[PDB]
Amino acid sequence: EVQLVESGGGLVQPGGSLRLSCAASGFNIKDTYIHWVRQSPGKGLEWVARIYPTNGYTRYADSVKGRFTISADTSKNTAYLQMNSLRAEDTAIYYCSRWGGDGFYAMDYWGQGTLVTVSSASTKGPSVFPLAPSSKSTSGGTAALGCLVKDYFPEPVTVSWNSGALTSGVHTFPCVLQSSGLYSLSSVVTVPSSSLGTQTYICNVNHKPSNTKVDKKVEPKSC
Amino acid sequence: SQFDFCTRRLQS
Amino acid sequence: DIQMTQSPILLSASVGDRVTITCRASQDVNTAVAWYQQRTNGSPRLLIYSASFLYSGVPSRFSGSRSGTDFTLTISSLQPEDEADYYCQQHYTTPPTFGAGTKVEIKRTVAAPSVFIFPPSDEQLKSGTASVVCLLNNFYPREAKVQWKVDNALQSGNSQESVTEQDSKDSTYSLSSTLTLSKADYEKHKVYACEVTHQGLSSPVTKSFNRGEC
Amino acid sequence: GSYNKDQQSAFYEILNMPNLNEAQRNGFIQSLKDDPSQSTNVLGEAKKLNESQA
Amino acid sequence: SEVTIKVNLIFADGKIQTAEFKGTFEEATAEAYRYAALLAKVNGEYTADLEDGGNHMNIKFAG
């Protein structure tokens, strides 16, 4: 299977530098173009740069020329984006993609994308509070419970339930930027009322920018 | 309508 | 540069319908236009390349066509899982450029929300902030009004909402509203009420608790 | 990798810039290595950042 | 300034779709009529009723 995997995105101060990698497998980047494409509210999907690793030819968007360089190491089947003199408008999800693979004249494979946050604020790990199921979160024989993941920066966090074995009825909400400048999100799951107390329910929270990994058990509050 | 970082979708 | 102009910005249709979205190139791009689908938390996925050709694995209900500089994407029998943002892209001149996107939403029958409320956790109350969470589960359409009342006084400026994207199976939404107080304020008042107005409800639903009750 | 005299000059200018911090200086040097065709553009952006941090 | 023109797409068989066009009032208007004419190619001649100073449109297709 063809696969591209970006890494290296994170929080970087204005004026600072960051280097992203794009690791390819299931094909050889010598046979295709490799592109970097970013996505942001300001510009939507926005082409950044491309390279033809067979001969080293590169091209850049005007807004990044001189501040970004693309390159590839065919020995490691990997492409790179060096990002210097970073600005607020560089904050974006950075994807890499291939073009021309198997003769397809389009971007037929993309990575999952790596997030770059250009900001002067500093990293902060979330507090993870349970949303305990109760008489006020149940009806029709089902009950809602969850986890509040409060006061983190930067994005992203990930939330799973019972190590990913619980997916049905899960709603993990989009984060909200609080006026403090810190993010917050909640994740809820709906389950049979009769399972409360016999089935263990744990939200697995990971905030990699602060090395924060939390497994919070959510149970009915006793009185 | 523009892309939204938190929803990862076009807003509406 | 070549700009790609997509319309409409939002299109909402029933399951089984035929939907058409369009993309206009500011100058001749020949057939060098691709269409991508982007679903929640995913990267763009190639649907159509070179204006009219189905990428491998893509369902045959997707089709594309070209007339001069006008490019259309058609979904002949809309499925719930086609809920997504769609983007066209030209590769005829560098820089390759993308349209601004068309969001496709599924129309379905009205469903009133399940309304739940969560006091601040005892853990959170240990430090100095209180978060009260109101949950509207699995409703359609998206429009809803959540109002917070604290001891019957309408709250304003101290709540934030978040809405999930349309469910890929039942096409419903869920919504959370979070009211944020200081702990001192939270311990000062008694009745915490979330009031939900929604088309599926015969009249607004209030869900509430008294601070300190079990 | 080796360099011609024009590319060597770019390295020399960026190494000597007094108002870059070391993360920035090495980031620009890394770009010069990444893509020598961009040498002139990379040098101009380095100059801009150095002047703005005077 | 930016406005949203809301449009009901009313097809001959009774099926209804809704769509939004955004931009300046003049851009959003032109896009709506352009889109109406495109769908008319396969759905039959259209007619467009305008409510609310033109910020909302009902567009029926003849089939």
CB atoms within 10 A of CB C90: 28
Half-sphere exposure of E21 (CA within 13 A, CB side): 26
Contact assignment for A84 to D45 by CB distance below 8 Å: yes
Residue C113: partners with Cβ closer than 8 Å, 6 or more residues away: C136, C137, C138, C139, C144, C174, C175, C196, C198, C200, C201
Q: Residue C8: enclosing H or E segment and its boundaries?
A: none
Give E35-47 as a DSSP string: HHHHHHHHH--EE
Q: Hey, is the C-beta of A17 within 8 angstroms of any chain D C-beta? A: yes
In 3D space, the residue among C188, C134, C96, C77 whose CA is nearest the CA of residue A137 turns out to be C134
Sign of CA dihedral D35, D40, D43, D49: negative
Give, as one character, the DSSP assignment of residue C92: S
Contact assignment for A84 to D44 by CB distance below 8 Å: no
**Do C1-108 and C109-211 come out as alike in CATH topology?**
yes
In 3D space, the residue among D18, A39, E48 whose CA is nearest the CA of residue B9 turns out to be A39
> Going by DSSP bridges, is the β-strand pair A183-192/C97-98 parallel, antiparallel, or unpaired?
unpaired
| Domain C109-211, architecture per CATH | Sandwich (2.60)
> Going by DSSP bridges, is the β-strand pair A127-131/A142-152 parallel, antiparallel, or unpaired?
antiparallel
Residue E50: partners with Cβ closer than 8 Å, 6 or more residues away: E56, E57
CB atoms within 10 A of CB C47: 24
> Going by DSSP bridges, is the β-strand pair A158-161/A202-207 parallel, antiparallel, or unpaired?
antiparallel
In 3D space, the residue among D44, D50, D41 whose CA is nearest the CA of residue A65 turns out to be D41
D52 exposed, middle or buried (CB, 10 Å; 0-12, 13-18, 19+)? exposed
Total structural domains in chain D? 1
Q: Residue D49: enclosing H or E segment and its boundaries?
A: helix D39-52
Strand residue runs (E) in chain E: 3-10, 16-23, 46-51, 56-61
In 3D space, the residue among D28, D23, D34, D24 whose CA is nearest the CA of residue D12 turns out to be D28
Residue C199: partners with Cβ closer than 8 Å, 6 or more residues away: C110, C141, C143
Domain extent, residue D51, equals: 1-54
Assigned CATH for A121-220: 2.60.40.10
Which of chain E's residues have a Cβ under 8 Å away from the Cβ of C19?
17
Strand partners, A97: A35, A110
Which of chain B's residues have a Cβ under 8 Å away from the Cβ of A39?
3
Give the residue from C4, C7, C17, C106 with the most E CB atoms within 10 Å of its CB, the best one to mutate: C7
Domain regions of chain A by residue span: 1-120, 121-220
Backbone angles phi, psi at D33, to 5 degrees: -70, -45
Residue A148: partners with Cβ closer than 8 Å, 6 or more residues away: A128, A129, A130, A131, A184, A186, C121, C124, C131, C133, C178
The domains located in chain E, with CATH, are 1-63 (3.10.20.10)
Q: With beta carbons less than 8 A apart as the criterion, state whether E59 and E50 touch.
A: no
Contact assignment for A136 to C160 by CB distance below 8 Å: no
**Edge-to-edge strands of the sheet including A3-7?**
A3-7, A18-25, A78-83, A68-73
Structure obtained using: X-ray
Q: What is the C-alpha to C-alpha distance for residues C131 and A180, in angstroms, rounded to an integer? A: 14
CA distances for E7 relative to C10, C44, C89, D51, E54, angstroms: 10, 28, 26, 53, 10
Backbone angles phi, psi at A4, to 5 degrees: -125, 140
Contact assignment for B6 to A176 by CB distance below 8 Å: yes
Residues C141-178 as b/e (b if ≥16 CB within 10 A, e otherwise) read: beebebbbbbeeeebeeebeebbbbbbeeebbbbbbbb
Give, as one character, the DSSP assignment of residue C165: P
Domain regions of chain C by residue span: 1-108, 109-211
Nearest Cβ partner for C103 among B6, B8, B10: B10
* C-alpha distance across the termini of chain A, in Å: 54
| Domain C1-108, architecture per CATH | Sandwich (2.60)
Hey, what amino acid is at A220? Answer: P
Instruction: Write down how long chain A is.
Output: 223
List the single residue in A with minimal CA-CA distance to D49: A85
Q: What is the C-alpha to C-alpha distance for residues D20 and E62, in angstroms, rounded to an integer? A: 68
Nearest Cβ partner for D42 among A15, A16, A69: A69
Which of chain A's residues have a Cβ under 8 Å away from the Cβ of C43?
95, 110-113
Residue C12: partners with Cβ closer than 8 Å, 6 or more residues away: C104, C105, C106, C107, E17, E18, E19
CB atoms within 10 A of CB D54: 6
CB atoms within 10 A of CB A120: 10
Structure-token match 């986890």, residue found: A147
Residue C87: partners with Cβ closer than 8 Å, 6 or more residues away: A44, A45, C6, C35, C36, C38, C44, C98, C99, C100, C101, C102
Which of chain C's residues have a Cβ under 8 Å away from the Cβ of A175?
162
> Going by DSSP bridges, is the β-strand pair E56-61/E3-10 parallel, antiparallel, or unpaired?
parallel
Which of chain C's residues have a Cβ under 8 Å away from the Cβ of E20?
8-11
E24 exposed, middle or buried (CB, 10 Å; 0-12, 13-18, 19+)? exposed
In 3D space, the residue among A43, A66, A221, A132 whose CA is nearest the CA of residue D37 turns out to be A66
SS3 A210: helix
Residues A2-32 as b/e (b if ≥16 CB within 10 A, e otherwise) read: eebebeebebbeebbbbbbbbbbeebebeeb
Provide the phi-psi class of C126: left if phi over 0, else alpha when psi is between -120 and 50, else beta.
alpha
Task: Residue window 1-12, chain B: list those with CB within 8 Å of chain A.
Answer: 2-8
List the single residue in A with minimal CA-CA distance to B1: A41
CATH no. for residue D29? 1.20.5.420
Q: With beta carbons less than 8 A apart as the criterion, state whether C113 and C204 touch.
A: no
Which of chain C's residues have a Cβ under 8 Å away from the Cβ of A108?
46, 49, 55
Let me know if chains E and D touch, i.e. at least 3 Cβ pairs under 8 angstroms.
Answer: no
Helices (H) and strands (E) in chain C, counts: 2, 19
A162 exposed, middle or buried (CB, 10 Å; 0-12, 13-18, 19+)? middle
SS3 A137: helix
CA C192 to chain centre: 28
Q: Hey, is the C-beta of C174 within 8 angstroms of any chain B C-beta? A: no
Q: With beta carbons less than 8 A apart as the criterion, state whether B9 and C165 touch.
A: yes
In 3D space, the residue among E38, A208, A75, B2 whose CA is nearest the CA of residue C98 turns out to be B2
Q: Residue D3: enclosing H or E segment and its boundaries?
A: none
Structure-token match 């995105």, residue found: A9
> Going by DSSP bridges, is the β-strand pair A57-60/E46-51 parallel, antiparallel, or unpaired?
unpaired
Q: What is the C-alpha to C-alpha distance for residues A36 and C55, in angstroms, rounded to an integer? A: 21
Strand partners, A139: A142
Q: What is the C-alpha to C-alpha distance for residues A205 and A211, in angstroms, rounded to an integer? A: 11
CB atoms within 10 A of CB D19: 12
Q: With beta carbons less than 8 A apart as the criterion, state whether A114 and A91 touch.
A: no
Q: What is the C-alpha to C-alpha distance for residues A37 and A31, in angstroms, rounded to an integer? A: 19
Q: How far is E62 from chain C (nearest CA, A)?
A: 16
Q: What is the C-alpha to C-alpha distance for residues A103 and A96, in angstroms, rounded to an integer? A: 18
Which of chain A's residues have a Cβ under 8 Å away from the Cβ of C118?
131-132, 134, 136-137, 146
